[PDB]
From a paper:
Peroxisome proliferator-activated receptor gamma is a member of a nuclear receptor superfamily and acts as a ligand-dependent transcription factor. Endogenously, PPARγ is modulated by various fatty acid (FAs) and their metabolites, playing roles in glucose and lipid homeostasis. To exert its biological effects, PPARγ depends on ligand binding, which induces conformational changes in the receptor’s structure that lead to a dynamic process of corepressor dissociation and coactivator recruitment. Through this process, PPARγ activates the transcriptional machinery and regulates the expression of genes involved in several metabolic processes, such as adipocyte differentiation and insulin sensitivity.
Finally, we solved the crystal structure of PPARγ LBD bound to AM-879 to reveal the mechanism by which this compound binds to PPARγ without inducing its activation. The most striking changes were in the loop between helices H2 and H3. However, the calculation of a Polder map and its statistical analysis (0.6772 for the calculated Fobs (observed F value) with the ligand compared to 0.3777 for the calculated Fobs without the ligand) supported the view that the ligand is present in the β-sheet sub-pocket of PPARγ and extends between C285 and M364. The electron density map presents three regions in which we could fit the ligand in different orientations. Our ligand AM-879 occupied the β-sheet sub-pocket establishing a contact with S342 and only a small part of the H12 sub-pocket, with no direct interaction with H12; these interactions are in accordance with its non-agonist properties. In addition, the limited number of hydrogen bonds and van der Walls interactions established with PPARγ residues could account for the low affinity of this ligand for the protein. In addition, the proximity of this ligand to the amide of S342, in one of its conformations, probably accounts for its capacity to inhibit phosphorylation, because it was reported that the association between the potency of S273 phosphorylation blockage by ligands and the strength of a ligand interaction with S342 amide backbone induces helix 2-helix 2′ loop stabilization. In addition, the poor definition of the electron density of the ligand in the crystal structure of the complex PPARγ-LBD/AM-879 may be caused by the limited affinity of this ligand for the protein or may be due to the multiple binding modes that this ligand seems to adopt in the LBP of PPARγ. We successfully identified three PPARγ hit compounds among a library of 80 molecules.
Author numbering:
A (entry chain B): 208 to 240, 243 to 267, 275 to 460, 466 to 474
B (entry chain A): 204 to 263, 275 to 475
Write the structure that this text describes.
Amino acid sequence: SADLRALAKHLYDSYIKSFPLTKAKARAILTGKDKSPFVIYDMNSLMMGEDKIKFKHIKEVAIRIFQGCQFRSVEAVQEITEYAKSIPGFVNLDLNDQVTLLKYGVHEIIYTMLASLMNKDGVLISEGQGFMTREFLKSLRKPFGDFMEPKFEFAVKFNALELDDSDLAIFIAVIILSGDRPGLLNVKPIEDIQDNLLQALELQLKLNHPESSQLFAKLLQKMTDLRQIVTEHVQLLQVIKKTEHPLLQEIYK
Amino acid sequence: LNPESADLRALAKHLYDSYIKSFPLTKAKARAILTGKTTDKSPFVIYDMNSLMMGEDKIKKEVAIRIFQGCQFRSVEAVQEITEYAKSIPGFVNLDLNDQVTLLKYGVHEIIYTMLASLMNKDGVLISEGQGFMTREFLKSLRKPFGDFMEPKFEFAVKFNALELDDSDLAIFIAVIILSGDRPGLLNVKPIEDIQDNLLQALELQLKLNHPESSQLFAKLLQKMTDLRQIVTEHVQLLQVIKKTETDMSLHPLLQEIYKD
Ligand SMILES: O=C(O)c1ccc(COc2ccccc2C=C2C(=O)c3ccccc3C2=O)cc1
């Protein structure tokens, strides 16, 4: 029966608790209500940002922008981990499987939620207190100007579906419970959970959006472009370190 | 039973029937050859270089290059078959002509491996309209670059064939792969999306009616496209290696057009 909604409300509740900056709060900053946010659009507005913005992650500018993204990546992984532990059935699985689920999942979820803080002209940074210009992100050089641009192109198409947090909570739960991650020992319970999650997502979309026919299908189709983005991201992550203090190097992966 | 559904089910019958008249070797006949139904003859199995020279006498230099350029002519013939099917998808021939070729350009490869799964089990693949069967371990035993082409399709086919789709489901699923709006360089995307919505609505109904005991087969089938597009990327990466390894070997012009990223 419609017990699916008890699941939908449960995960949305944990979504609000795990993630401080929600999508509704991010579009309001983006759109405009408020109390604004610092805008970084060139080289000098960057150095002023490190004085007024909340940059807690610090001698060349294109590298420091990449290090800051890597710093918040490991921040998001902790928030994603806490939310996964609230997905019913997750903590009861094999412990090795929980690791590999998160190991191969956090990237797809990072960029899914990055689209929430991204308009067509830039991205919100530092819990919405700053806004880095998209044109300034391609401004970079060598390999850096392209690391963020393919995600803008993804965010534009993903945001056109106009999903809210109640939809995204179930969606990312479906991503974590992917039974096709390499090295899984017990796939059956993972697929059993994800199927229960897909049922929840299909009912959520048809209820929340009688607008969009087959929006469930289109959202599933985005998981294709969501693994192509993660593929070419690590394709860039090895071109950077093929070029360019082991204790910060150990903090990151 | 309702006019909403009657529309989509008539659309399913239409696609299923163009499917039959576009593709000579259905999955139903393939499964008959591969398991051993009396409705079909039995293939000649090729597992080493010895049984290869015997296929010439039964079924219609450099052996590693040979199997590949027979793969090429097979892909060419299927692109023709895929095109004939695409012309039957309601609305497709009414979309912009350069968008028509854009859908086919990025579409044929994803269709090929879907239909290639119908000719496969875990042990090998049917070849030459079902008269032959080339074992999977013989294909790996091939030369240093050529031994790597086929096994990714084998890994996908076994996971994909586990969905247990029959030709009725594939006809609609193949139709939704051709008509997708995210392919690059598309001029007008909205008419393409309006047709795909119809096709996916037809697939959703067809899967729930044909496979009513399989929970959420619609969702699991759609995510198999992430597997298809990675196979295409691995394939392209092997084509740029062979193009510089064997600079004496030719590639078909038709596939040389799908051959641009
Ligand atoms: O006339 C000759 O001498 C000839 C030689 C070898 C083959 C074997 O070939 C196939 C034949 C039928 C069905 C499938 C294949 C094999 C393949 C692939 O290996 C492949 C790889 C990528 C896309 C499509 C295909 C495909 O259809 C065919 C003809």
